Amino acid sequence: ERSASIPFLKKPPALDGSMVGDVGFDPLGISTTIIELGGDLRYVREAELMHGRQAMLATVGFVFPKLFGKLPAEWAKDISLNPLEAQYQIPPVALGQIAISIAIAEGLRSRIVFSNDPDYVVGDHGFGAGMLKGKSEAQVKDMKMKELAHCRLAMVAITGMFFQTAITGSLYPLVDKF
Amino acid sequence: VDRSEAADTWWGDKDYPPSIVLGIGKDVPSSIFGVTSGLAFAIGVYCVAQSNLVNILSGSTVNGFYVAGALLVPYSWGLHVAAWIQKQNGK
């Protein structure tokens, strides 16, 4: 009858607590219109996990090359330490290598993403799935919830760091002046 | 809005609209509607005259308050039609 995250708005009809990180947070009702259309929230959850995991990797990579040495610097020595300028300075060889690897990996991902298989657990691509062999159901759900929390935090973190580096050029307590 | 969730506002068999057409103002009396419509007409025509007739408009003289008050003239028309509708509906 009422959301848990926002305790003065109605609970989203689409969300019903049967998902990791379901705290009834949908003021717009994007989930509501999705289920009214006829879809299911598997796609949005998988997009959440994908965006988040990318955001965590990119958060660490935003500050690593400055706080720690920018590699042994055979070719990277020319490229600036500012992440917003490093993107426009990768050499063609390295840019093509990384682009090809990402493209092949996500072309592999696409078929299972857009399949009709119900066995597919959302955000379960088999990469390092061996540590859940011994985990219990409560442990599995709680670990997936820590994953989702980290995802959700890193997504906002990149927006903060990107806008701060664009408008100020410096993150305040950590990396400065880059 | 769907086909089902829509009020019965057809009034071709009757002499005046139902008050439901007025929506949020389905209960404000005809007296309030008429007084507000008259004040709106006077204020809006004053604003329009002060903006373009008494003065000459320009980049350095366009006035936001007069521009906004100009929009009370069509609101005045709506309010006077509303006053008639509520007077006929008995409110």
């Binding site: - | 809005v1 829509a6 506002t9 057809w10 071709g12 002499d15 980049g59 350095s60 366009v62």
Partner: protein
């Protein structure tokens, strides 16, 4: 954006482009971004880009306002079926009025297609009539073939 926030938006019209301006060069160039000079740019014989930018900015205000007319999941708004149902003139002048038109339009795709095609044909005639009378692109007026 200090003029925009202070509300002194006439500073964006102040200092328009001069009549001796040459398109693509800084000589004779102004600083105004939003003007209503009208007429045509003398060198190019096309309307001022400041005028066109002001046009698109204002027209958008109007359309973004008008896009809050109808009721969508928040109570405030309008009901098109209700509007059509009530619009019947007194004493049955236009018969039963516009009753049933909502149902027919929303059920029949051909009526929607016909309305769209009529509106778009009128708009195509309008652009044909307006582009030649009021050129908007630089040096198009002297390009007679185009």
């Amino acid at each position: 954006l200090t003029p925009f926030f202070t509300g002194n938006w006439g500073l964006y019209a102040e200092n328009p482009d001069t009549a001796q301006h040459i398109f693509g060069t800084s000589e004779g160039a102004g600083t105004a971004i939003l003007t209503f000079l009208g007429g045509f740019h003398p060198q190019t014989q096309s309307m001022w880009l400041t005028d066109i930018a002001h046009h698109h900015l204002a027209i958008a205000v109007v359309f973004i306002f008008a896009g809050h007319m109808y009721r969508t999941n928040w109570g405030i708004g309008h009901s098109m079926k209700e509007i059509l149902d009530a619009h019947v003139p007194p004493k049955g002048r236009l018969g039963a009025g516009h009753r049933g038109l909502f149902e027919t339009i929303t059920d029949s795709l051909h009526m929607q297609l016909g309305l769209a095609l009529a509106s778009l044909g009128v708009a195509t005639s309008l652009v044909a009539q307006h582009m030649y009378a009021l050129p908007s692109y630089a040096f198009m007026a002297k390009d007679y073939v185009t």
